[PDB]
Amino acid sequence: MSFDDLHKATERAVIQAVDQICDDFEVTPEKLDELTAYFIEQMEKGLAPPKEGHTLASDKGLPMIPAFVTGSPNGTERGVLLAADLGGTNFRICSVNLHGDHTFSMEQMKSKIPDDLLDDENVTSDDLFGFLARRTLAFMKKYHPDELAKGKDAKPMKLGFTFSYPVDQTSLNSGTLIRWTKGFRIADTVGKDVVQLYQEQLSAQGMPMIKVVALTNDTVGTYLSHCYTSDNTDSMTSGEISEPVIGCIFGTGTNGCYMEEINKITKLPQELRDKLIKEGKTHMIINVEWGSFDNELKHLPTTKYDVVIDQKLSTNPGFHLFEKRVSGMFLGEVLRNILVDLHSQGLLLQQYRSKEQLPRHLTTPFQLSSEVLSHIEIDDSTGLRETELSLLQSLRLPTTPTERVQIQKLVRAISRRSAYLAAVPLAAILIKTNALNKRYHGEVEIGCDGSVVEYYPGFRSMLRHALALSPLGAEGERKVHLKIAKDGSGVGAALCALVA
Amino acid sequence: MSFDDLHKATERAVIQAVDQICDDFEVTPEKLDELTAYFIEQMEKGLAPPKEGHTLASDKGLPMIPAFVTGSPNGTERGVLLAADLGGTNFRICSVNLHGDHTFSMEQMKSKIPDDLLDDENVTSDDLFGFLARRTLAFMKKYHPDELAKGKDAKPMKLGFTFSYPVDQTSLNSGTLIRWTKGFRIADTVGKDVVQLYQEQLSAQGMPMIKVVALTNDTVGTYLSHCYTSDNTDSMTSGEISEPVIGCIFGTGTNGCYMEEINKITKLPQELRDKLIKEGKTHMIINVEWGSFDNELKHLPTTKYDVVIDQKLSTNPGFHLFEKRVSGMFLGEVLRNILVDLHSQGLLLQQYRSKEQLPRHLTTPFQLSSEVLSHIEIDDSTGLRETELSLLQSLRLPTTPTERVQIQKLVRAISRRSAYLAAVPLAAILIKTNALNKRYHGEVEIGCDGSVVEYYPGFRSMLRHALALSPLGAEGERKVHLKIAKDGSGVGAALCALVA
Amino acid sequence: MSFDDLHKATERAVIQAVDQICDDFEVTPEKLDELTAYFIEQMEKGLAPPKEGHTLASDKGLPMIPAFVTGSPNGTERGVLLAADLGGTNFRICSVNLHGDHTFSMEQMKSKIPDDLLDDENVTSDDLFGFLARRTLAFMKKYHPDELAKGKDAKPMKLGFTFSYPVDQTSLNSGTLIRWTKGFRIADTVGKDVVQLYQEQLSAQGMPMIKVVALTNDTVGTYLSHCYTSDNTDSMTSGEISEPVIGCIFGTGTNGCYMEEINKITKLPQELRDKLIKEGKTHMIINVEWGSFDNELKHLPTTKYDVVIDQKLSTNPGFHLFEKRVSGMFLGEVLRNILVDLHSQGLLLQQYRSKEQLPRHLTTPFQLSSEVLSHIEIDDSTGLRETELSLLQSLRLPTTPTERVQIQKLVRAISRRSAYLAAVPLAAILIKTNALNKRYHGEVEIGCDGSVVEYYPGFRSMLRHALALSPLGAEGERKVHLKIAKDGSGVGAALCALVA
Amino acid sequence: MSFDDLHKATERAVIQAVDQICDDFEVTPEKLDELTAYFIEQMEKGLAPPKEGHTLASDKGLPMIPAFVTGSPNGTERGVLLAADLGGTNFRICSVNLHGDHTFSMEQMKSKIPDDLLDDENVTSDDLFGFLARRTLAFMKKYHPDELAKGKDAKPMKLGFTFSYPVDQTSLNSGTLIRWTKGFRIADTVGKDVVQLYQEQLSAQGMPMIKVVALTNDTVGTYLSHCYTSDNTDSMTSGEISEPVIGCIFGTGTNGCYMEEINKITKLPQELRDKLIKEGKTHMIINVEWGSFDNELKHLPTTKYDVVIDQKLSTNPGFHLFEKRVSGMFLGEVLRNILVDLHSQGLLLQQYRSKEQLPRHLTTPFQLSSEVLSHIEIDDSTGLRETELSLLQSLRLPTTPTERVQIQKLVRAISRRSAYLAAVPLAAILIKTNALNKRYHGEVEIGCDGSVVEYYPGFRSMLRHALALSPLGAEGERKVHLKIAKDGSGVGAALCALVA
Ligand SMILES: Nc1ncnc2c1ncn2[C@@H]1O[C@H](COP(=O)(O)OP(=O)(O)OP(=O)(O)O)[C@@H](O)[C@H]1O
Ligand SMILES: OC[C@H]1O[C@H](O)[C@H](O)[C@@H](O)[C@@H]1O
Ligand SMILES: [Mg+2]
Ligand SMILES: [Mg+2]
Ligand SMILES: [Mg+2]
Ligand SMILES: [Mg+2]
């Protein structure tokens, strides 16, 4: 045994731990099927009246929100509307000029949500909504300075507001916050009317001229934006015309929505179901809180790393268990926990004696962005050798050549687990509504927004693969196109405000 | 307001524009009566000597041509004669074997008039007449190759020549072109002898053996052909025997002719009226240039779409205003202008941003054939849903379901306007000559040739209806039969050549 | 037995004959597989050196032409070039402004090929090429009148010439006509240089300024045009990037071409293969004369109606047997022969006593356009009842209600036979070159031009179905997109002239 | 010429433009020498009294600031002090426990400077300093919550304040802002006392307990931190003991400072020079505003891209010309301007028709971070092929394979130009003070902080190379070590506060 043979014995120990992790992470079709079936069962429960002791702030299971849109655009909608979009790492304000030909011209200003609003439980509703109103002034000064200069007399501006949190919507115009998720801890807005808080701050800042017309989700805005764009009006002689079914968000969090029959939403008051069916409003866009799927954990492929994020690092433990396996914030956090744990086992970061000596950004939660993971996974031979080091050097964590390949294997296992689980709600929705066979012919479109699905170098293809593996089978995959709703939330909110 | 309600609001706007057009197009009996009366007044003027400053190339009003036929056949005429027929979208050569029993056996060769002769003002008389002579050689090679092989010694062939243009006829044998109409722009034949140009080209091509015997119109040939065929010799005990009164053309253009008393044609030289009355030639077949009726526009139900065709798209602006409302070329063009105008209003072709993006065949004049209109109008429920799309797809213009019904309404309004106006000259002629009461009993026949009246799925019945609405009343309609002179122009020219 | 029961007994006899025909026409997967395999065998033979006694004018089998393009565009090509396109029912001249962004702006003039050039064996090379030169003058007068006015001094204009006939190409600049097909009988151009004849006539007409730069086929132009347009440059993170493989023509005739490895074309001189491989010219676009597939008839599903067209009605008996089953000219002719034969059997046109009394346009060959078939097939319930009559009325053939449904069944059987046979060459080409598996991922595009594939209300979907039935299987169909190369031949020739 | 040959001709055009740019960017030793010599001349002028008409807000040339530190640490300094650090993309607060053994334990909180303070001229002193005070409260709540809870009675906290802007320092305790640079436009703080504004806001927010003890630069803090750490106390028998000479910042901006003899600072009042020399204070740490070197542009290798940044995009045109060639903000901006200009020339982004169609983040200034450049440059073969696309995809700019290599060449040319120019001030300082020969033996240390020097995968080695190329020669490079002052500004300010 030379030093090189002794080193190989160590490398084999490292490899076994990494392979064990990779196998714990991979989703096998058997679980993909248990999950699709369970997802559908929870979807039916999510439409049902609550039992005694249940509420929305505390529910568990897979709740659904009956957003009152009740239809979809065809691209002919026209007009200029404002849109606000809150809830990722950032906030955006758009001015969307809908042209009536399946396109729009969008102006945009965007900013990061300041950490003053995210790291402290003592942050109030006035700090968050005061922020949004100040950014709204900045937007108006750049794109519509005249309306701002002429307000209060200039009027109205119609604004749609996308707010990416579960909202107990009662009307397209308004609803209340059910809970904060995804990084916000601002407790005094839970139960309050989201539009009311924003609208009051807009007036407080000098813009009584801007009226918030509609409150929507990101999933809904995405679906509607997707519907507005492309064509879906081809010739009936081209042989097949597609239809939008499902909207997705794969960003800091994960969600989607779909068109559903109004007569099946048993929790909606019957009087409202009757009022709407009488006008031909046979369908609603339902926000399925995918993130909450299996919060009780009867089927998801949970490992110890997911337990740690959910119980110790997350802002809302016990909720949004699906997101913790799928969305961008947790793809990042899962790798960080693995690297720290393989430090403790003495397998990767062998040079440190012990955890307290690790780089501070490695031990601090959420400092490993899914952006680094994107580069870690795409890197091929020379990327892995040289760039993987640069990518982790930016997290102050220098590594060896052999360590870098082991880290890449962990990253691919993490993103694969997510991409396959991410297919569960798409298969489950298409199957529940029989989207694939409600019509003899016509393709199924899924309009997905969010930076993980748009940029992660692997999701577009891994979802298609996973859909084929799920109960949809190859035949279902053949009907189903994953398209990107790039301007997704912005256009969607503008359309919601147009609808009012 | 859901997307579906917003879409209905748009559909209502579309409908209002289409209904406004349909109402502008419909001819009400009040105008049908003003027009019948005006038509008769212009017919009397059309027989009168001209005033100083008037000529035939430039006249206005409703000119008539005193074709020198002076009588009608009874079906006993026999012999084999050639016939040439120029002036629609095509040209035909026939060899008609008249059998003497109200029937004939017709051989035919036909060809399209090449665009080389239609789209350029620099086309000469030698190109048009050279064309006719070359097609004549082709005809002879197929049906009478022996006469061609034996010519110059084989002789004579007698040919009748139907030339569908106003001709200043001086004798059945010849006359000059008054103007070009209906698509021809060959200026150097205006004022020239039509037979002379054709006869010279026949010799130039090697056929000195063929003599053009008679020059006729299509209206005249149709009347005579109609008279030749059926019976009109039934028993006097069958209770009632009919007589031919009016011939019609409803093809690329529109015209007709009728039998008139020679003593009323005040512009004909008196010496000629005397020469003919002395031989019992009490009547002449008069070509009424229906197409020119109301060229000055005092009564026709003119809309902006007709103004555009007459001033911008037509080959002879200011003339043939009636045809522009009635004939096949303009049924086609009127729809095209409406669709382009409803594009500009944002009502039908809503997907284009603006006119320059429309299919090139939609913006190009005369590319919308009345043939497409025929199918657009006949289509019932499933035809409208599926075939209307195919019909416009052939014009490269894909449409929506709701657009297709709106287009069909416009098409029916266009063909109805034409069919009712088309009744004006038939009512006006029968009334002026008192065809309905010159005899106690005996039916009135109108022998109409032309593809619009023969195939358009609506003219046969719409004219009968319109005749009943006009001053003829139901009582006049009861005397009047619309029959189709199917082999119309061919037989007619053969008879004209037989007459010489 | 009442009259109605006796009539049903007759209808059953009619139905049996129609069903027998429909079954003779349907292509079963077993034959679709024999044909794909045979097509591939003949394709290999088509690349081989000839045997003694063989030439190109007379070959039989499935010849291929090694067009010297040797590559494909990526959309960045820019410049303004002229293009001429001869050989369908018409001729087109374009001026194509290539912009370098996968789009172009095309100006166009088009005209029908006059019958003077099609119905007579005594037509010479000077009449056909004189025609093309005259239409070229007309084009220049409308789009580039200044170049024409300034020529001879203004120069050069670069023109690509698409000539849809087999051409024994020796260089992209020129080659000779192998045979006339598809309606032309002009024997004295066979064996002559196609460009030389056109170029001389352009000078004869006054345009020494226009140089014909490249001679191409329609199949080649279509492939290149298809390649030029869309993108095929998406992100490698979108998950899959497509590549053009096969170009198609489904118009008056049928053909296609594909990219092939130069080292496999064994008949090309080795010295030329070496000259080209040394510059990286690893592939050529090969015109596969699909029309000639199985001219000897060992596998095609031939019936008596196809025998009649090939031996009695066609301009080139014994050749282009595949086209006679597939292309637009013969979809039309096959129905006509069936209707005449069912007249002779006393089943459809029961009112005539015998063939000589049938409408002359029914007994005359090629008067039944595939355009009528398009409408006959698309028509649903009310279309069949009312429009089928109008469509055949335009062929002067009035029918009964029961006759109309029987005719529609025959039409669908005819177009299905064609659509399935039409898939044979696409499956055969993709399989021979392993287009489906030469790369792990990336879609396969087929760029098809021609009015049958673009407008016939059934081909887009019937080909996709047939491809799945053929040896490609569903898995091959999943890679394969049928797209329409709408401006196909025009752009292609402009690119060929750009290439020179 | 095949499509592939035509494409190569285009690629050659692209390459020539890229090579021309690369050659314009490369710094040749001849200029490196002109610049070193000029830098020294301007350094002498920078110590001189001003001429009439000169001030500090407007100076030009290379000003120096005589920070009143007057000495350096040896690692024995002990105590716990707070430190604030403002002025990059972010702001940091530290609590540094100096231990007296060349090490310290640092606690840290950091946040991004909100855009509310950077994009608007109407931002006031109260918004910037209010921000710093609020972040200070957050820091105290996490690391010293007891002092905050006990204040006002708990006291004092001693805070050092690093403020990375030129400051007209009069005492280590305070000075005024000379100008804003590097992204700030807050005009009403220019001329005001920097400590006074911060100190007042700390009291306003509830922390009268924290006293700002010292105001320093980042360059000074870095030098002192560097001096505090390692050893520099080795045995005199180890053969050679090093000494710190120069501190550097290579972050969003670029600067450094060095120890200089007090008797040479001719602009300092003589009375102050005498007061200090009498106590043995023979040296001062002088901030050399490297960024301002050659603001008048007599020697820097200026190209058109640098002119655009300086005159159109920068917050302070005419100043800090050296930084615009060297620092992280402009490495980013220079590439962006090149890519847009090569779009205009039609060489890289060939698919767009024109600038208005480019991705909005490409045309927006400063959206291309030097972070992307880091990855673009490090990428080797497979990194360039796949990751370069991901890196630009994050700027919404998809590219081709050939485009990616051309972009990488531009990036390496940009970072090389910077790295070589970046050596000018280090060579110039060591040469001016004869750091290399003031002692027979002992190494020269340069302590550089800042993320470009710490992470850019190329600076550590390119500076060493450039130093050898400059007048220092290989012999000077052999004395000179580039080390990283990682905790640099934080420790430095804590030491400045310890010094008071
Ligand atoms: N290129 C990338 N590769 C991988 N992950 C990325 C990339 N860019 C952003 N992300 C992830 O996406 C998150 C931002 O999500 P996104 O841009 O979709 O905003 P969002 O719509 O506001 O999110 P949400 O809708 O859930 O609130 C980041 O925190 C990071 O985790
Ligand atoms: O137009 C389609 C095809 O028609 C004929 O079959 C020709 O042989 C062929 O070269 C051409 O491409
Ligand atoms: Mg979002
Ligand atoms: Mg006629
Ligand atoms: Mg063609
Ligand atoms: Mg700094």
- CA atoms within 13 Å, Cβ hemisphere of D317: 8
From CA C405, how far away is CA C32, in angstroms rounded?
A: 28
**Cα–Cα nearest to A24, from A342, A414, A405:** A414
D chain contacts of residue C236, beta-carbon cutoff 8 Å: 386, 389
Residue C426 · residue A205 · CB < 8 Å: no
Q: What share of chain D is helix, strand, coil (3-state, %, to 5)?
A: 45, 20, 35
Which CATH code fits D76-217?
Answer: 3.30.420.40
Looking at ligand 1, which atom is closest to the CA of residue A329? 31
Between the CA of residue A420 and those of A295, A300, A444, what are the distances in Å? 18, 11, 19
Residues 6+ apart with CB under 8 A from D489: D83, D85, D92, D162, D218, D221, D222, D225, D449
Enumerate neighbours of C (3 or more CB pairs within 8 A): A, B, D
Instruction: Report how many Cβ contacts below 8 Å link chain B to chain C.
Output: 76
Residue C114 · residue C131 · CB < 8 Å: yes
Helix (H) or strand (E) holding D11: helix D3-25
Distance (angstroms) between ligand 6 centre and the Cα of D480 equals 22
Q: Is chain D touching chain C, with at least 3 CB–CB pairs below 8 Å? A: yes
Ligand 2, pocket residues at CB < 6 Å:
C 87, 164-166, 181-182, 217-219, 249, 251, 253-255, 289, 291, 320, 323
Helix (H) or strand (E) holding D177: strand D174-177
Q: Which amino acid is at B154?
A: A
Name the interface residues of C facing A (CB cutoff 8 Å). Answer: 237-240, 378, 441, 455, 457-458, 460-461, 464, 474, 478
Q: Return the ligand number nearest the Cα of D252.
A: 6
Phi, psi of D312 (to 5 degrees): -115, -30
CA angle B387, B392, B393 (to 5 degrees): 90
Query: Between A76, A234, A235, which is nearest B10 by CB?
Result: A76
Ligand 1 neighbourhood includes A87 CB (under 6 angstroms)? yes
Ligand 1 neighbourhood includes A254 CB (under 6 angstroms)? no
Sheet of strand D90-99: strand arrangement: D104-112, D90-99, D78-86, D157-163, D210-216
C412, C413, C417, C423: CA torsion to nearest 10: 40
Between the CA of residue D65 and those of D38, D193, D258, D259, what are the distances in Å? 19, 16, 11, 12
A467, A469, A473, A479: CA torsion to nearest 10: 20
From CA D366, how far away is CA D370, in angstroms rounded?
A: 10
Q: Return the ligand number nearest the Cα of C181.
A: 2
Query: Between D3, D353, D390, which is nearest C73 by CB?
Result: D3
Distance (angstroms) between ligand 3 centre and the Cα of D188 equals 38
Classify domain B218-500 at the CATH topology level: Hexokinase; domain 1 (3.40.367)
Q: Return the ligand number nearest the Cα of C216.
A: 2
CA angle B200, B203, B208 (to 5 degrees): 125
Distance (angstroms) between ligand 2 centre and the Cα of B257 equals 50
Radius of gyration of chain D (CA): 24
**Residue B416, SS3 per DSSP:** helix
Instruction: Report how many Cβ contacts below 8 Å link chain A to chain C.
Output: 24
Helix (H) or strand (E) holding D214: strand D210-216
Residue B416 · residue B373 · CB < 8 Å: no
**Residue C281, SS3 per DSSP:** coil
Residues 6+ apart with CB under 8 A from D368: D332, D333, D335, D336, D362, D395
Ligand 1 neighbourhood includes A456 CB (under 6 angstroms)? yes
Beta-strand (E) ranges in B167-305? 167-171, 174-177, 210-216, 243-250, 254-261, 283-288
Report whether the peptide linkage leading into residue A174 is cis, meaning its omega lies within 30 degrees of zero: no
How distant is the Cα of D294 from the closest Cα of chain A, in angstroms?
33
Looking at ligand 2, which atom is closest to the CA of residue C218? 12
Q: Which residue has the tokens 């007698």?
A: B158
From CA B424, how far away is CA A73, in angstroms rounded?
A: 49
Tokens of B384: 């409208």
Helix (H) or strand (E) holding D483: strand D480-484
- CA atoms within 13 Å, Cβ hemisphere of D167: 28
From CA C103, how far away is CA B275, in angstroms rounded?
A: 74
Put simply, the answer to whether C237 touches D389 (Cβ < 8 Å) is: yes
Name the interface residues of B facing C (CB cutoff 8 Å). Answer: 108, 111-112, 114-116, 119-120, 134, 138, 360, 371, 374-375, 378-383, 385-387, 390-391, 393-394, 455, 457
Count other C-beta atoms under 10 Å from residue A146's C-beta.
10
Residue B368 · residue B336 · CB < 8 Å: yes
Distance (angstroms) between ligand 6 centre and the Cα of D163 equals 9
Q: Return the ligand number nearest the Cα of D86.
A: 6
What is the distance in angstroms between the CA of the first residue and the CA of the last residue of chain A? 77
Tokens of B294: 């109301």
From CA D176, how far away is CA B128, in angstroms rounded?
A: 96
Query: Between D360, D385, D387, which is nearest A387 by CB?
Result: D387
Q: Which amino acid is at B211?
A: K
**Cα–Cα nearest to B176, from B201, B197, B154, B207:** B197
Ligand 1 neighbourhood includes A255 CB (under 6 angstroms)? no
Count other C-beta atoms under 10 Å from residue C112's C-beta.
12
Q: Give catalytic status of residue D72 as yes or no.
A: no
Beta-strand (E) ranges in A76-130? 78-86, 90-99, 104-112
Tokens of A235: 């010739």
Put simply, the answer to whether A460 touches C378 (Cβ < 8 Å) is: no
Domain ranges within chain C, ordered by starting residue: 1-75, 76-217, 218-500
Put simply, the answer to whether A375 touches D387 (Cβ < 8 Å) is: yes
Tokens of D38: 């000029």
Ligand 1 neighbourhood includes D394 CB (under 6 angstroms)? yes
Helix (H) or strand (E) holding D469: helix D459-469
Breaks in chain C after residues, C-to-N cutoff 2.5 Å: none
Between the CA of residue C154 and those of A179, B138, C158, what are the distances in Å? 76, 41, 12
Query: Between B120, B374, B390, which is nearest C374 by CB?
Result: B390
Residues 6+ apart with CB under 8 A from D367: D336, D361, D395
**Cα–Cα nearest to B114, from B136, B83, B100, B135:** B135
Residue D106 · residue D490 · CB < 8 Å: yes
Q: Give catalytic status of residue B234 as yes or no.
A: no
**Residue B42, SS3 per DSSP:** helix
**Selected residue of B1, B5, B6, B352 to mutate for chain A interface (largest A Cβ count, 10 A):** B6
Query: Between D138, D360, D378, which is nearest A386 by CB?
Result: D378
Q: What is the DSSP string of A319-367?
A: S-TTHHHHSHHHHHHHHHHHHHHHHHTTSS-TT-SSGGGS-HHHHSTT-
Looking at ligand 2, which atom is closest to the CA of residue C87? 1
Count other C-beta atoms under 10 Å from residue D307's C-beta.
13
Beta partners for A86? Answer: A91, A163
From CA C33, how far away is CA C41, in angstroms rounded?
A: 12
Phi-psi region of B279 (alpha: psi -120 to 50; beta: other; left: phi over 0): alpha
Q: What share of chain C is helix, strand, coil (3-state, %, to 5)?
A: 45, 20, 35
How distant is the Cα of A462 from the closest Cα of chain C, in angstroms?
9
Residue B491 · residue B228 · CB < 8 Å: yes
A chain contacts of residue D93, beta-carbon cutoff 8 Å: none
Beta-strand (E) ranges in C155-275? 157-163, 167-171, 174-177, 210-216, 243-250, 254-261
Instruction: Kindly tell me the burial class for residue D308, based on how many C-beta atoms sit within 10 Å of its own C-beta (0-12, 13-18, 19 or more).
Output: middle
Phi-psi region of C171 (alpha: psi -120 to 50; beta: other; left: phi over 0): beta
Calculate the CA B66 to chain-centre distance.
18
Resolution of the coordinates, Å: 3.8
From CA C262, how far away is CA C285, in angstroms rounded?
A: 9
Q: Ligand 2: which residue has its CA nearest to atom 11?
A: C164
- CA atoms within 13 Å, Cβ hemisphere of D120: 17
C59, C85, C193, C218: the catalytic one is C218
**Residue B399, SS3 per DSSP:** coil
The greatest distance separating any two alpha carbons of chain B, rounded to the nearest whole angstrom, comes to 87
From CA C306, how far away is CA C21, in angstroms rounded?
A: 12
Pairing of strands B167-171, B174-177: antiparallel
DSSP state, C50?
A: P
Distance (angstroms) between ligand 4 centre and the Cα of B87 equals 7
Q: Ligand 1: which residue has its CA nearest to atom 4?
A: A371
**Cα–Cα nearest to A217, from A261, A270, A189, A258:** A258
Residue A383 · residue D387 · CB < 8 Å: yes
Sign of CA dihedral D233, D239, D243, D248: negative
Count other C-beta atoms under 10 Å from residue D7's C-beta.
16
Q: Which residue has the tokens 């118009």?
A: C251
- CA atoms within 13 Å, Cβ hemisphere of A109: 19
From CA D310, how far away is CA C212, in angstroms rounded?
A: 53
Breaks in chain D after residues, C-to-N cutoff 2.5 Å: none
Residues 6+ apart with CB under 8 A from B40: B428, B431, B432
Residue A469 · residue A434 · CB < 8 Å: no
Beta partners for C84? Answer: C93, C161
CA angle A31, A33, A38 (to 5 degrees): 95
Q: Which residue has the tokens 């095209």?
A: B336
Sign of CA dihedral D69, D75, D80, D86: positive
Q: What is the DSSP string of A205-229?
A: TT-TTEEEEEEE-HHHHHHHHHHHS
B364-397 as b/e, with b when 16 or more CB fall inside 10 Å?
eeebbbbbbbbbbbbbbebbbbbbbbbbbbbbeb
DSSP state, A395?
A: T
Residue C119 · residue B111 · CB < 8 Å: no
From CA D464, how far away is CA D444, in angstroms rounded?
A: 13
Q: What is the DSSP string of D270-321?
A: HHHHHHHHTTT--EEEEEE-GGGTTTT-SSS---HHHHHIIIIISSSTTS-T
From CA A376, how far away is CA D87, in angstroms rounded?
A: 31
From CA C16, how far away is CA C3, in angstroms rounded?
A: 20
**Residue A83, SS3 per DSSP:** strand
Count other C-beta atoms under 10 Å from residue D25's C-beta.
23
From CA B402, how far away is CA B417, in angstroms rounded?
A: 23
C chain contacts of residue A464, beta-carbon cutoff 8 Å: 239
Pairing of strands C64-67, D157-163: unpaired
Put simply, the answer to whether C386 touches B393 (Cβ < 8 Å) is: no
Residue positions forming the annotated binding site of D for ATP? 110, 487-492
Enumerate neighbours of D (3 or more CB pairs within 8 A): A, C
CA angle B107, B110, B115 (to 5 degrees): 170
Put simply, the answer to whether A457 touches C378 (Cβ < 8 Å) is: no
Residues 6+ apart with CB under 8 A from C454: C250, C448, C484, C486
Residue C489 · residue C225 · CB < 8 Å: yes
Experimental method: cryo-EM
From CA B144, how far away is CA B137, in angstroms rounded?
A: 10
Give the chain D residue nearest A110 (alpha carbons).
Answer: D115
**Residue D392, SS3 per DSSP:** helix
Query: Between B6, B346, B353, which is nearest A77 by CB?
Result: B6
From CA D59, how far away is CA D62, in angstroms rounded?
A: 8
Residue B251 · residue B217 · CB < 8 Å: no
Sheet of strand A78-86: strand arrangement: A104-112, A90-99, A78-86, A157-163, A210-216
What is the distance in angstroms between the CA of the first residue and the CA of the last residue of chain B? 77
Q: Which residue has the tokens 């105001």?
A: D215
From CA A366, how far away is CA A333, in angstroms rounded?
A: 6
